[PDB]
Structures are given as structure tokens and as C-alpha cells.
Amino acid sequence: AMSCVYAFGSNGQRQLGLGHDEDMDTPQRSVPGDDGAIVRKIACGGNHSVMLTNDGNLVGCGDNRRGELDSAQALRQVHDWRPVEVPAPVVDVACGWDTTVIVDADGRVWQRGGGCYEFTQQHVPERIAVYGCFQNFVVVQGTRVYGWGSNTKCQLQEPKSRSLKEPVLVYDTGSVAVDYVAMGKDFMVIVDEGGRIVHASGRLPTGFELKQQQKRHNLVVLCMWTSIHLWNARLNTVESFGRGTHSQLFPQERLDFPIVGVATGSEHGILTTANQEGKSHCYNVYCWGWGEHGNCGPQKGSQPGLQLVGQYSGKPRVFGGCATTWIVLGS
Amino acid sequence: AMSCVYAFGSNGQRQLGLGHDEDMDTPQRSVPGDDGAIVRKIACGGNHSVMLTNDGNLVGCGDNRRGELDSAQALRQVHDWRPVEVPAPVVDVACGWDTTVIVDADGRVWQRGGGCYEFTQQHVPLNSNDERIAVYGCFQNFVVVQGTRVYGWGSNTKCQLQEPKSRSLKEPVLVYDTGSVAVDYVAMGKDFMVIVDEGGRIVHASGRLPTGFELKQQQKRHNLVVLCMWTSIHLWNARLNTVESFGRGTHSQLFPQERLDFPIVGVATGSEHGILTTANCYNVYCWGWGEHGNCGPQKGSQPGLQLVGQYSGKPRVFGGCATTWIVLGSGSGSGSGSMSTYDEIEIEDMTFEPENQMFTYPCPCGDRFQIYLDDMFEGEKVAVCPSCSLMIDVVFDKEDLAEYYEEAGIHPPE
Amino acid sequence: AMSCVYAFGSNGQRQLGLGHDEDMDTPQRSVPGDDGAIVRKIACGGNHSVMLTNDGNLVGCGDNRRGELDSAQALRQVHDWRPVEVPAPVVDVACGWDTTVIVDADGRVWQRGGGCYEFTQQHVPERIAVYGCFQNFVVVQGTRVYGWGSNTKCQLQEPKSRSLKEPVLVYDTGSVAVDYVAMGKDFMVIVDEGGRIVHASGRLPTGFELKQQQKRHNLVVLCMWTSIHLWNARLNTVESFGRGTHSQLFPQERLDFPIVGVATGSEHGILTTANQEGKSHCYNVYCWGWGEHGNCGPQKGSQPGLQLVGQYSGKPRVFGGCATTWIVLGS
Amino acid sequence: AMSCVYAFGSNGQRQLGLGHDEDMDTPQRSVPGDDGAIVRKIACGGNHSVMLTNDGNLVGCGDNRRGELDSAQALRQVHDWRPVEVPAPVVDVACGWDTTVIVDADGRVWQRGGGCYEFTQQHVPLNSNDERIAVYGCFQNFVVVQGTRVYGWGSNTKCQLQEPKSRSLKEPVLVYDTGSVAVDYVAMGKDFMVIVDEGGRIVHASGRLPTGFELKQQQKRHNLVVLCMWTSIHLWNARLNTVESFGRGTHSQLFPQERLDFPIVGVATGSEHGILTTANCYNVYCWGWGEHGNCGPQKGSQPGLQLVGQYSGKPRVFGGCATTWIVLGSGSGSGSGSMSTYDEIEIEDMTFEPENQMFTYPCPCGDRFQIYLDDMFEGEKVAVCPSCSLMIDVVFDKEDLAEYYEEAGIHPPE
Amino acid sequence: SMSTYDEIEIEDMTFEPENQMFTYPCPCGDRFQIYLDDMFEGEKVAVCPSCSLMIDVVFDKEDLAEYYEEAGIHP
Amino acid sequence: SMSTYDEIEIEDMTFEPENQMFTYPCPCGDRFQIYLDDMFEGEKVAVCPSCSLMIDVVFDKEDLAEYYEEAGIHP
Ligand SMILES: [Fe+3]
Ligand SMILES: [Fe+3]
Ligand SMILES: [Fe+3]
Ligand SMILES: [Fe+3]
């Protein structure tokens, strides 16, 4: 029972937990204080990163100049992985640009950062999950989807209202339960357990016609800051919608390997495929999109196409951040 | 951050930047020194190639027996891509047969080559505002376009600048003057010239026009895109999805009047060959005279379109004298794989810092895009990231700036 | 009434009539003593060249160390175009490696060269024509085909007999008349007026299956030293058979221009096409095959494909030699 | 006369000979200096490329921090194609990880690199006749094959030379010895080795063979063509028209066991990738590990064959460490566009000149191929043209020479 | 009898008095060339040495007198 | 948990006592690398800095004592 964590990419604020502030272009072993408890989720802000283990503990590293990590206001940066002070054991975690949001075992939602150095409870009206990106957060319970934060693009409600401090009702189904919420910079895509898009607010990237996508079944929706990506298991490919200025658009070339996992960072994608060519089956992890900081591998030119960053015997879990890539392995 | 520059065609003076002098019939990667650079625009002469970068630098390669590139008279040829010395950061660049003309950020027009081994300033009467200054050049003529007005100099044997005939004009004269609509660009041939406004209309043409091209008949049309070879004019008709060609066409320069299956998204011309870009991902074709490989492996100059490359993102292409340039991820434009502006943010979503008098906005790398209050008063809307090469556009008016001057407690220069 | 002659290629013995002994890679104006009489045929040896005008005159230039041109044994090389002494006005001419064969107005066949400095009549048993290449000559009259010279490959008869001084009966049809004889180094291809191959002796280059080619109609047969080329007007292409070590094999790519003329030298081809793209129609002349000496144009690397050497308003007549190319224009 | 050498793949130390150090995913023309040269064979190391020409010269580019190319210790890297100094005209060349081994016309084996900045002779016991001397090398082992016998040196940690294990063997030892049939070639991997005779039979194998490869089962087969990657063996089965692969294949090195539509005419391997050549004109494919572009634009190492080029004439390909070389018109071989032997002429058709003691034959350029009587007594049959680059083979026996010695009035050394 | 790429006035040709030759830029980077001595004999076609193309030089015999004088040579 | 390209014996690795690092040639031209300090802590995987690939170094703890001594350093 052990989860190894490998990280690479942007590291200017030591948000990779490697101890140093140098950008990496190959997977580096990121060892916390424990490294014995298994990893549940790795949420990433702009310059900070938090790691939620399955024991309710939450460690973090990176920038703290906006209070996204520790309550010590004189603590500007957390050098290595450090325990994040929480009012109660954490069940789920999410990060905004300079904020951190947790959901504890008591069902309470807490938010720190964005100038606020103290964990402040967000009062939101059975499984409870939290999702966040940029300047927005969302809490999902059953069929109801509550969200707060920015609203300059009508990602929460009507009309354009700069910001909402109090959690509002973003969307209700209100029959089939909501599985997750894939959110970008100023937009949002709500998906049910069936696998179909049920709602989408904010400004969606070009080409993404909402009414046409709501008729499709069994989709896995991923979101970068300025693009939406749809994992189509049936066709074994990823459909991308957006400007694609820096190769964020997934290569429409034939994928011979079976896709078994897809994740996205701020402006890059992480693909996990099944390599079955040997006597033993393994897993290839690819990266596509903007990778100047090495978050896509040694080739940092953001050229179109997949880039192989690693190959593992066990199926890895991957997480994306702001020009950072996290690969989690099971020993 | 790196532009993928492909080059092929005539390489007699190493103007392809490949180190060797062998003619290429398939797109070769041309890498400016080490790790390359972000390439904004490529201009081409008879035997020299000029490559403008995103930060206003000029890198060049090719012949130098006329002083097109380096000031060293002893240097007859530039082996590989070498920095072309400039008096100021370059905004725009054009080339002639053996000349290189630039336009700097200060708004001055400099010209080297043609015997002169030093950048001599060309004195064209211009204004001092955000009317940007564009330069265009071909053969023995250059043209400067600020807005509405078009100034030019060089040869005048065919009356392409004024009347009557003159062997040369050293000092720039007013070629043509609108009107109402600002001049978009000037398509130039060997001894002729075609002026187009932003409405896609042919406002004026001078010099020896190729046969079959009646100026009065074409001036009535609009939404046209005009391209020019040395001895032929090519009108991109997006509406009917075809290119109309005018000239002898003794070497297949006349565009194939066959119904294309793909929509045309880009047309450029070299000296005597054309480069077509279509959709489907993105196909690049070549037609016309190509016995130097500038049209692909088939160098027989047969009629039709040769596929020379297919790309995921829309490339911008440049034509030279029997040469063809294909650039991926330029600086900048718009579209897939363009590596252009990351996003356009409105000033109301921007984070204003009174103490620093600058606007910041979160960058996906972890840093922040930034733009100064003073620079925006001067008409700048581009915010750059001090870490990575990502840029954003700030959407604002001069009226919007007044609010932030009042918040910072500073009187604006109004 | 005037024929301009343009030449280029191998010129080591001044066989281009340009006066100098420098190899040319672009068409050079070759002006004889007359240049007013129209050219009927230009025959080429290894290092000598002769030009037959329609007035019965025959001029020549090049090597004479084997007596292929002038009877003056002390004359080793003919600097510029010079009248070739003939016993009678010439109707047809042909050249071997170091030999010259003419057919006069009296119907007599004369041969000079190959060590013999005097024109010596060849006694051969109505139109009379002569064809020659390398170490063999052929005289065609009606249906009968007579030939002499080398026989080491059974190009004349059976068995292998080193050489035949006396003209023998190579082949009789003997119904339909014989149009011409396309001959290579050590082989031969006989064609009738119908346009079909009727006979082929000597060692034919690989791939050329004789029995299969004799069933085809309307073919124009060309021969290099070690390859056979078939002009197919119907398909508008040239079928090549041989090793093709130096691009002698005609490019099987689609020819958009109508082929209006084909000629071959020792190891290279000359194609004439009709360029109809302008308001005025003109003619493109291409070259393919081995062209180190510039006989194919400025590109002397013998790379595969056609090479444009010129473009003319009137349909040119082309002739091939030993790494030399002759383009004849009408003023 | 010029060979068209295409190169792509790993280019970290400029080993592609393109001047830059950017990895290429499409075949780039590599031009040795000016006007290039006729390329016979290309050998590849870890970070250096060696190119043997038709006249016995070595031209190289790449790393030099181990002395693989130049003797100058100060020179850490060779920028472009530069002449590699040789003690004598080179007949054959091979490369190791950081080593270059040649075989000269005198029959001596020289080795540089691996610390040594000078060509030191390797003393392998050979004979003095027309049993030609071939050299083969990979990783840390080299092998010299004259005929029947196979000598080698280098690493011995996996017992690929003899028994038992040794960290290194500086002096060459007899690896394996036939028998009857002469050894055709030796396919070499990282720590293993496969020896094949002219009958296409695996006569001997040593070292750590990849998994699934039973030596005793394969020795029973014949007419096989053996290729080797670092960690895999590949058998070209022309009869069933397929390549049989043996190894882990964790990066698609295992050849696609799908029925090919075209007949296989050529198979070569790099360090961990394969290059397939098929007919139809001539298509070149790549499979295996290619995340450096050595397999084409797709660098995901997915299973299958990537088309990287199509050619009119059959090219010969060479594999390196994450690099791929394609040569058109080499020196020499056989086939279309090979620029090989022009023709083979029998001595009875040859023109003998007693006064000059040489045989001549008409060349299509106007000159004459020529070969000396003395050289033919020593076993030479190639007649060359003193003007152009055309060559012919003279078909004769030592018995045939007696006639011409009697005609010239000269006693032969018999 | 030549098919020409363009017709050029003699005033537009670049004259080189050193070697009595007229030149003009060619779309391939090279230059069409034609000798003064040839033009006096009636020659009107300039040739590029690296390409197929040809141009016609438009001139009269009396237009040559100026360039002969510039080279310091009489016809 | 890593998928490795090959298994290498420690005797086959190139040791650099200057910076206490083990290297081994990589099919891309570069070298798999692994630090002695890491190997003493149980690390067994060498990594190439320019490529995806990884190898396993086969060694026991007592095999490290020789290389520590060669570098002049104690664990
Ligand atoms: Fe940034
Ligand atoms: Fe020759
Ligand atoms: Fe030209
Ligand atoms: Fe590597």
C-alpha cells in the first residue's frame, strides 16, 4: 500500500515538491513527509499544489503570498511538502488560481487563499464533491450544482455580475445525478452519471456547439483554460474544441493504442494508453499541447502531436496543473 | 517557443539557410543558428533571404556582393543565418532584387543593398500616430504604406510611380492617394504595382500590367485578394473559390481553372510560381514555374497543383525568386498552431495594481501577463508574460483609462 | 528557309561545332559554314558529329583519329564545321562509334572510319535508308533489312561471330514494309510502317519481353546503348526497359503535356512536348537520363525526372549523340 | 555524379550533418561540404555519423568528446561534414558507441575513439588474397570478417566473443570459425552477435540473445536475412514475405505481423527502430521506437509502419541511434537509380592495346573505359572512365590473360 | 524562333563595359546575358546560364553605339 | 512500478567518481543516469534526460562499497 508521485513542468515557486525551484522536463520523484499513504487527488493552483491522501490528510507546497496554503502570513513560500492545517479531515479538495477549497468529513466546505489567510467556510445547501478552476469553484451534491466566484462571463447565472461571494444554484437536472463538473477559465461543463453533457455556462471555446453535444452519450469531458476536450472511448480518440494556438487541439490521427485515461492541465493534455505489444502489458503516458516549461517532456516547442513521457507497468493516475504534470504510481 | 521554418527551391547562393548550395525540391527545415527563433515574416530577394523575428531582429543568409545583408564588402556571401545589423527594432521588412528595406519602431525607413553596404534612411513624409507603417518591395521598386497614402521609389521606366518615364527615383514620391478607405496592402510585380484597400477593392494600378488585365473592369469588383508574380497578376476570388490569373502563362503560372475540392484559405506568390493553401488538415500546393524544385519534386513546370506538404495547423507561406518558404507557428496571425495571441481579455477582468501602475492577468504557466498604464495611453493593448512567450490582448478605450488614473492618484497626460 | 542548330553536352573533341572544346550545359548556337540550308539529319559518333542538309551536302566536326571525318590522315581533329568529302551527294547518313556511313543519290552505300581513312563502298542487295549505332550499321530497303559489323551478341545472325565485313540479311518481313530500325549498343529493334515491332536481335535489356511487345500496335521505338524506350502516344507516356542505373528509365509520372517528339542519345533521352497554356502555343524540350556533361541541362546529377532545357515557338527537331543533345529550329 | 543522402532523427550533437542540432521527423538532405560526394556506406555511432565515399575517403560529423572523428582533443564537436583523416584508402567502415573502425586497401584494421584520439591499428591475423575484409560494429564490440573466419574484440561481459566473462578484450580473438561456406555478414546487437553465411543460414550466435529466440531452432532454417537492434533480432523471411521479430517490443520494435501488400525488398535496423523498403515505385517505411522523429512525424512509438518516403529508384538505408539515413545513387550495388556498374563487358569484346598494356572500351560520353593488364592479374575486373564516373565490369579468368601477354610480347608473373 | 519569357528594352538591361555584356535579373536569382558583339550581328535573345528561360532584347542597331562608346570600343 | 527498457548489471554501468553518478548508453545517443547516493537508499532505476526510457540497475547494497571507495567517500 504505497503511492509514488512523479512531477514535472513549471516549478518557479517550488510547486512540484522537489525542494528546488527549477523547471523540469522529465518525471521527477516528489516525496512528501509520508509517502506511505496512498494518493487520492492532486489539485493544482497557479503556483501552489496540494495532495490529498485517503487518510484525510492534506499536504501542500508552493506559493503562499495569497494565503493559499498556510495561515502564517509571513510565510511567503512553502519549500517542501508540508501539512496543510485543516479544521477537519479532508474528503475532497480543489484549487483556483490562488485559492484552496476542501470538503471535510462533516460535510462542510472551507475556502482559503485569494488574500484570505484563514480557512473560511462556504455555506452550501449522499455524496458531496468539489471542483474548481481559475476564479471559480463548484460544489456538487446529487443533482444540484452550486458554484461561486467570478461571473463576468455568466458561468454561474444571469447577468454578468463580476463576482458572487455566496454560493448560488448553477444548475439542477433534476432527475439523473451529476457525476462531475469539467470547468475552464471562464466556462463550465456539467456531466451526469449517464455520460452526457447536461449543461454548459460561461463563454465556451469556438466550435463547441452545446445543443449538438447534448445528444451524445458516454462522453468524458476534460477542460483546459481555453478549450474543451471530449474523450470518445467508442472511436478511441479525443475531440478538441478551441483556438489551438499552441497545439492544444488533440491530434486527429489514428490512435492504435487503447486510451485508458485522459487528464488536462491549464493548457496541455495528459494521455494514458495501454501498450500491449510486449508479452507483458504496460501503459504509455503521452502529453500534448503547450509545454514550454517541460510539462510535456524534453521537447518544449509545443509542436503538434503526442509526446511520450514515460512507460509504467501499472496503470498510473495523472493530474494536470498550471504547466505542471503529475503522474501517480502504485508500488 | 520556436517557429518551424521550411524552405525549398533555388539555393545557388545558400539563400535557403541550409548551409549547402544545392537546390531542394522538398521542404527542408531551416534553423536560424541554435534553437532557432520565432519568425514573424520572411522577405526574399534575388539571392538573399531575410527573416524578421518577433522581437524586431533581422537574421539573414545568401549573397552579399551588393551589400544586401552584411556591411563587410569583403564578405561576398553569408554562409548560414546571421544577424543583420539594424539601427532600431524592426516592425516590417521587404526585399528587392539586391536590396533590403526595413521599417523601425521609431517609424523610419532604412534601405541597404544595391551597391550600398550600409543602412541609409529613406525620407518618406509620414505621420506620428498609430497609423502603422508597412513596406512592400519587388525587383527595383519599394513602397511605403502608412494609411490612405502610398509612397514609393526606385525604377520608373514603366511609369509605376509617376509620369513620365525615369530610369530611377532616389527620393520617394506620392504614388497614389485615397480617398476614404485605408490601404490594406500593395501587391507588386516586376515593373508594375497594384494597390488594394481594406474593402478588397483595387483602388489603383500602375506600370506595365500583364496582358488580359483590364484595370477599369476590375476596379468595379470588391472583396478581392491580389497577388503578383513578376509577369502576372493573380486575383483570389474567395466567393467562387478560385484564383483568377492574368499573364502569358508559358510556364503554368496561370492558376488551374479546375473546380477545387477544398476551400482556399491562403494564396501567395514567388517570382514566377504560386503557393496554394487549402483545408480538408491543411494542404499546401504549388503551381507555376518550378524547375528549381520550388514547386516540389516535379520540375517540369507542368500545369496543375503539386502537393508539397500537409500540416495540422494553418501555415503562412512566402514566395521568393524560385524559392518557397513555409512557416509553422509564426508571430503571429491567428488560427491553429499559430502560436499567436493566447487570449483577448477585457480591461474589466484585468487586475490593476495602483502601486505599480500596471495591469496583470493570470498566465497558465503560473506567472502573470502584464501591461503598463502609460503604454496603453500610447495605444498599446498587448500584455506580455515575463516568463513564457504567451501574449494577450487587452480590450479597452482611452476613456476606460481615466478610471484607473483616478484610483492610483495620478493625473493622466490628457 | 533556314535551320538553326543548337547543341550542348560532351564537347571534349569539339563535336558540338562550337569551336571550343568545353562541355556545355545550355543550348549553344552551332553555326556551320552555310547555316542557310535546312537540316535533314544530325548523326553522332562517339567523338564526331555530322550534319546532313537537304542539298546533299554533309558537314562534320570532331575527332578524326580513326578517319571518321576527313581522308587527311594527319588531320587528327576537325576544329569547326567542315565539308565532308563525298563521292556523291548524300541522301541519308549514320554514325557508329568511330565510323561514318552515307547513302548517296546513286543508291550506293559508303563507309569511312574505324581506322579506314577512305570512303569504302558497302555492297548491299524504292526507298533506301541507313541506321547505325556503336559497332553496327543497318541498311533498310522496302521489307529487307541488311546489316554488318559486330555480331558478338547475335545481332545480325547465328552464331556469335565477332564481326561481319559483308552485309548480311538480318531480317525479312516479308510483306509490310520496314519503317526504321532502332538500334542500341549490341541489340536491334526492327519496326514496320504499321507501328509494331516485327523483329529484335542481339541482347535486349532486362524486362523487354519480345513476344509480348510484338502484339502491340502504333509504337515508336527508341534505343539508348543499354535500354529500349517505347513512345506510347495513346497513353501519352514513354515505357522504358533497362537497368536504369543513371535515371535512363522514363518517369512513369503523369505527363500533362502532349508528347510530340522523342529522341535518345547514347544514355539519355530528349522529350518534346506541346505547351498549350498560353494564348500562343509553344513547345517544351525536356531531358532525362545520364547527364554529367550537361547534355540534360544545368542539373548534371543524373537525378530522376524531366529537366526543361528550352522552350520554342516552332516545333523543334531533336537528335541525340554520345552525351550530346542537338535541337534544330526553323527560323 | 552525386549521391542524394537523406537524414532524420536524433540530432543532439549535429550528427545529421545539417548544421543545426534540432531533431528531424522528415527526411532532410544532408550535403557533405560543397557539391557533395558519392556515398558508398554510412556507419553510425551514439552521437557521430561516418560516411564512406566511393574513393576511400571518410567524411564525418557529430560528437568528438571521445575522439570519434577528429584528432583534436580541443574539438569537442564537429559542426558540419568534415574529412576524417585516414592512414590509407578505406574499403569498409563500422562504428561503436563512441568509436570508429575502418579497413584500408592494404588490409589493415584501424580504430579510433573511446578515449583514443588517434587511429590505432588492430592486429587481427588475416590472409593476403582476394578474400575481402569486412568490418561490423555495434555498442562496445567490433567484428572483422575476411572469409570463413570471424575475429572480434571489445566487451565480453555477456560472453559474445569467448568464455568466460571479461570486462574487455583489447586484442582480437577468433570468435567463430567455419566450416565450408564463407561468412556473408555478422548481425550485431548490444551485447550479442549473430553470424550468417552466404547460404542465409545462422552459423553461430553468442552473447545475450533477446527472449523468444531459440538458436537451435533457427539454425535449421536457410535463406534468412538477419537484422539486429540493440535488444532484438529481426529475421527477414523473403519466402513468406515478412519480418520475424524477437524481443520485448515495449516500443513497437516487433515488426507488424500483418500481411503486407507489397513485396519486401530491403530491411535495415537502427538502435531500436526498423526501416522497411517495399515495391509497388519504392516505398520506405519505419517501425519501432521513434520519439526523436527517426520514424517520421508521429513520435508516439505506436505499432505499425510509418511511410517516410517514396522513391523512383531503390535506395539503401542505414540505421543509427535514433537516426535514419536514406541514400539515393550510392556506390554502388545494383538496380534503378543506383548509379552502380554501367555494364559488364566480356574480355573478348574489349579492345586490347599491347603498346599500353591496357584494355579499353567505348564510354557513352565519348571517352573509353580502361583497365590495366597488371591489375587484372591481381584480381581486378573494374574498368573506369578517366572522364566521367561510369564504371564497367570485365568478365575474365586468369587463363584468359595469358593470350594478351603473348601478343604484347611480355612474360606474365606466372 | 525562341519562346521568350519577357521582352526587355535595351535601356532596361544592365550593361557591363568591362566585358561588353548585357545582363538582366532572372526569376531564379541568376541573370539573362547577351554580348554586345552578338547584338551587332543581329542577336536579340539573352540567355540565363542556370535555367531554361530566355528573353528578347528590344533594340535597334543605332542603340548600340552608346554602349560601344561606354566600353571604349568601336564596332 | 516503472516499465524498463533493459536490465543492466552494475558492473556494466559506467561509474563517474567525480560526481558519484552511474551512466549507461541510451538508444537515442544520451545516457541513462543514476546517483550512488540514491542507490544506497534503495533506488534501482536509471533515467535518461532526453527520452522516455528507463533501465533497471541490478545490484546489491554490498556492491556499492567498491564505488564509494573509488570516489573516496563513505556512505
Ligand atoms: Fe507565462
Ligand atoms: Fe566516360
Ligand atoms: Fe534563370
Ligand atoms: Fe535516451
Q: What is the C-alpha separation between E48 and E23, in angstroms, rounded?
A: 9
C-alpha cell of A53? 491522501
Whats the size of chain B, residue-wise?
Answer: 414
C37 residue type, one letter: A
Which chain E residues are closer than 8 Å to B271 by Cβ? 27-28
Q: What is the C-alpha separation between B315 and B317, in angstroms, rounded?
A: 6
Q: Which residues of D are annotated as a binding site?
A: 363, 365, 385, 388
Burial D69-108 (b: 16+ CB within 10 A, else e): bbeeeeeebbebbbebebeeebbbbbbbbbbbbbbbeebb
Q: What is the C-alpha separation between C81 and C15, in angstroms, rounded?
A: 9
Q: How far apart are the first and last CA of chain D?
A: 39
Task: Collect contacts of C83-90 with beta carbons under 8 A, ≥24 apart.
Answer: C83/C33, C83/C57, C83/C58, C83/C59, C84/C50, C84/C58, C84/C59, C84/C60, C85/C119, C86/C58, C86/C110, C86/C119, C87/C119, C89/C55, C89/C56, C89/C57, C90/C52, C90/C56, C90/C57, C90/C58
B193 closest CA partner among B169, B218, B161, B217: B161
Which chain F residues are closer than 8 Å to A298 by Cβ? 49-51
Q: Which residues contact B312 (CB under 8 A, 6 or more apart)?
A: A247, A249, A251, A304, A305, B281, B282, B336, B337
Instruction: Report the C-alpha dihedral over residues D172, D173, D175, D176, rounded to 10 degrees.
Output: 120
Determine if the peptide bond prior to B366 is cis (ω within 30°): no
| F51 in a labelled binding site | yes
Which chain E residues are closer than 8 Å to B7 by Cβ? none
- Rounded to the nearest whole angstrom, what is the distance from the C-alpha of residue D10 to the centroid of ligand 4? 10
| E28 in a labelled binding site | yes
- In the block, cell 522513391 appears at D311
Longest dimension (CA), chain E: 34
Assess contact for B48 and B59: CB atoms under 8 A.
no
Longest dimension (CA), chain B: 71
Other C-beta atoms closer than 10 Å to the C-beta of E7 total 11
Three-state SS for chain E is CECCCEEEEHHHCEEECCCCEEEEECCCCCEEEEEHHHHHCCCCEEECCCCCCEEEEECCHHHCHHHHHHHCCCC
Ligand nearest to the CA of B365: 1
DSSP state of F3: P
Which chain C residues are closer than 8 Å to E47 by Cβ? 26
Q: What subunits make at least 3 CB pairs under 8 angstroms with A?
A: B, D, F
C-alpha cell of C319? 537528335
SS3 of residue F71 by DSSP? helix
Which chain D residues are closer than 8 Å to F10 by Cβ? none
Ligand nearest to the CA of D271: 4
A324 closest CA partner among A291, A299, A295: A295
What radius of gyration, in Å, describes the C-alpha atoms of chain B? Answer: 22
Q: Which of B302, B306, B307 to mutate to test the interface with C (most CBs of C within 10 A)?
A: B302
C151 closest CA partner among B15, A25, D349: D349
Asked whether the beta carbons of residue D291 and residue F27 sit closer than 8 angstroms, the reply is no
Assess contact for A68 and A99: CB atoms under 8 A.
yes
Burial of D178 by CB count in 10 Å (0-12 exposed, 13-18 middle, 19+ buried)? middle
Q: How far apart are the first and last CA of chain C?
A: 7
Query: How many angstroms away from the CA of B254 is the closest CA of chain D?
Result: 29
Q: What is the C-alpha separation between B384 and C196, in angstroms, rounded?
A: 75
Q: What is the C-alpha separation between A139 and A130, in angstroms, rounded?
A: 4
Query: How many angstroms away from the CA of C16 is the closest CA of chain E?
Result: 18
Which chain F residues are closer than 8 Å to D230 by Cβ? 27
Q: What is the C-alpha separation between D45 and A58, in angstroms, rounded?
A: 49
Q: What is the C-alpha separation between A272 and A257, in angstroms, rounded?
A: 9
Phi-psi region of C149 (alpha: psi -120 to 50; beta: other; left: phi over 0): left
Query: Please, do chains B and E touch (3+ CB pairs < 8 Å)?
Result: yes
Assess contact for F16 and F1: CB atoms under 8 A.
no
Strand order in the sheet with D358-362: D343-346, D391-395, D382-384, D368-372, D358-362, D351-353
Query: Please, do chains E and A touch (3+ CB pairs < 8 Å)?
Result: no
Of A247, A266, A323, the CB nearest to B337: A247
C-alpha cell of A308? 511520450
Q: Which residue of A has its CA nearest to B38?
A: A301
Q: What is the C-alpha separation between C8 and A81, in angstroms, rounded?
A: 79
Three-state SS for B186-237 is EEECCCEEEEEECCCCEEEEEECCCCCCCHHHHCCCCCCEEEEECCEEEEEE
Phi–psi pair at A305, nearest 5 degrees: 115, 170
Assess contact for D396 and D346: CB atoms under 8 A.
yes
Identify the contact set of chain D against chain B, taking CB-CB distances under 8 A: 18-22, 24, 26-29, 31, 33-36, 80
Cα–Cα distance list, B210 to B233, B254, E6 (Å): 7, 12, 11
- In the block, cell 487549402 appears at B278
What radius of gyration, in Å, describes the C-alpha atoms of chain F? Answer: 12
Q: What is the C-alpha separation between A107 and A34, in angstroms, rounded?
A: 26
DSSP state of C257: S
Q: How far apart are the first and last CA of chain E?
A: 26
Q: Are β-strands F31-35 and F21-25 bridged in parallel, bridged antiparallel, or unpaired? A: antiparallel
C-alpha cell of A115? 488574500
Q: Which residue of D has its CA nearest to B309?
A: D26
C-alpha cell of A274? 495501454
Q: What is the C-alpha separation between C72 and C51, in angstroms, rounded?
A: 19
Could you tell me how far CA E61 lies from the centroid of its own chain? 13
Sign of CA dihedral C44, C50, C53, C56: negative
Approach to solving: X-ray
Which chain residues have CB less than 5 Å from ligand 1, an ion? B 363, 365, 367, 385, 387-388
Asked whether the beta carbons of residue F9 and residue D230 sit closer than 8 angstroms, the reply is no
Helix (H) or strand (E) holding D377: helix D373-377
Sign of CA dihedral D24, D26, D27, D28: negative
Phi–psi pair at D226, nearest 5 degrees: -100, 125
Asked whether the beta carbons of residue E27 and residue B272 sit closer than 8 angstroms, the reply is yes
Helix (H) or strand (E) holding A313: none
Could you tell me how far CA C123 lies from the centroid of its own chain? 23
Helix (H) or strand (E) holding C72: none
Q: What is the C-alpha separation between D288 and D228, in angstroms, rounded?
A: 13
C145 closest CA partner among C123, C122, C177, C120: C177
Which chain A residues are closer than 8 Å to B281 by Cβ? 252
Cα–Cα distance list, A212 to A199, A207, A217, A236, C157 (Å): 12, 11, 11, 20, 81
Enumerate helices (H) and strands (E) in chain C, giving the number of each. 1, 26
In DSSP terms, A228 is beta-bridged to A223, A241
Q: Which residues contact C225 (CB under 8 A, 6 or more apart)?
A: C133, C134, C184, C185, C266, C267, D364
Ligand nearest to the CA of F53: 4
Query: Please, do chains F and E touch (3+ CB pairs < 8 Å)?
Result: no
Helix (H) or strand (E) holding B375: helix B373-377
Cα–Cα distance list, A71 to A19, A56, A63, A78 (Å): 21, 19, 12, 11
C-alpha cell of D315? 535506395
Q: Which residue of F has its CA nearest to D319?
A: F27
SS3 of residue B348 by DSSP? helix
C-alpha cell of D172? 582480437
B55 residue type, one letter: D
Q: What is the C-alpha separation between D281 and D267, in angstroms, rounded?
A: 16
Query: How many angstroms away from the CA of A272 is the closest CA of chain D?
Result: 12
Q: Which residues contact A41 (CB under 8 A, 6 or more apart)?
A: A51, A52, A92, A93, A319
| E48 in a labelled binding site | yes
Question: What angle (nearest 5°) sits at the alpha carbon of residue B13, between those of residues E32 and C287?
Answer: 55
CA contacts within 13 A on the Cβ side of E49 = 7
- Rounded to the nearest whole angstrom, what is the distance from the C-alpha of residue B348 to the centroid of ligand 1? 20
Q: Which residues contact D25 (CB under 8 A, 6 or more apart)?
A: D8, D293, D294, D296, D297, D299
Q: Which residues contact B315 (CB under 8 A, 6 or more apart)?
A: B277, B282, B284, B326, B327, B328, B330
SS3 of residue C5 by DSSP? strand
Assess contact for B122 and B153: CB atoms under 8 A.
yes
DSSP state of F10: G
Asked whether the beta carbons of residue B367 and residue A266 sit closer than 8 angstroms, the reply is no
Instruction: Report the C-alpha dihedral over residues A252, A257, A262, A267, rounded to 10 degrees.
Output: -40
In DSSP terms, C230 is beta-bridged to C221, C239
SS3 of residue C203 by DSSP? coil
Assess contact for B343 and B392: CB atoms under 8 A.
yes
Cα–Cα distance list, B197 to B145, B204, E4, E41 (Å): 11, 9, 34, 50
Assess contact for A44 and A95: CB atoms under 8 A.
yes
Phi-psi region of B187 (alpha: psi -120 to 50; beta: other; left: phi over 0): beta
- Rounded to the nearest whole angstrom, what is the distance from the C-alpha of residue B133 to the centroid of ligand 2? 60
Ligand nearest to the CA of F55: 4
Asked whether the beta carbons of residue B21 and residue D34 sit closer than 8 angstroms, the reply is yes
Of B22, B24, B31, the CB nearest to D20: B31
Q: Which residues contact A145 (CB under 8 A, 6 or more apart)?
A: A138, A139, A169, A170, A171, A172, A178, A181, A190, A199
Query: How many angstroms away from the CA of E59 is the closest CA of chain C?
Result: 19
Q: What is the C-alpha separation between C180 and C53, in angstroms, rounded?
A: 20
Q: How far apart are the first and last CA of chain B?
A: 39
Asked whether the beta carbons of residue E5 and residue B231 sit closer than 8 angstroms, the reply is yes
Tell me the DSSP string of D234-252: EEEETTTTEEEEEE--TTS
Strand order in the sheet with C178-183: C178-183, C187-192, C197-202
Which chain E residues are closer than 8 Å to C298 by Cβ? 49-51
- Going along chain F from its start, the domains and CATH numbers come out as 1-75 (3.10.660.10)
Burial of C246 by CB count in 10 Å (0-12 exposed, 13-18 middle, 19+ buried)? buried
C-alpha cell of A323? 504547466
Cited resolution, angstroms: 2.9
Phi–psi pair at F62, nearest 5 degrees: -75, -10
Sign of CA dihedral C24, C29, C35, C36: positive
